[PDB]
Amino acid sequence: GLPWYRVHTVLINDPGRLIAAHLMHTALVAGWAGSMALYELATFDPSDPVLNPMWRQ
């Protein structure tokens, strides 16, 4: 069968599933950005932009 490192080649001649895989990557990336922002908001201290700005945190 296909080796492990070629499994995604099944999409080369399947535009619909390629779009699906791209959609899922895009879902993952956007989910990352949302999750990351939530974690930051749950840890970020806004009380001192002078000596404790975002880049120190």
Ligand X SMILES: CCCCCCCCCCCCO[C@@H]1O[C@H](CO)[C@@H](O[C@H]2O[C@H](CO)[C@@H](O)[C@H](O)[C@H]2O)[C@H](O)[C@H]1O
Choose one: 12-20, 22-30, 32-40, 42-50; the region binding another protein (CB under 8 A): 42-50
Task: Check the annotation: does 29 bind a ligand.
Answer: no
Backbone angles phi, psi at 34, to 5 degrees: -65, -45
d(CA 8, CA 56): 41
Q: Which does 42 bind (CB under 5 to 8 A by kind): another protein, ligand X, ligand BCR, none?
A: ligand X
φ, ψ (nearest 5 deg) of residue 36: -60, -45
- Considering the complex, state which of residue 31 and residue 46 has its C-beta at the smaller distance from another protein: 46
Per the annotation, binding residues for chlorophyll a are 8, 22, 25
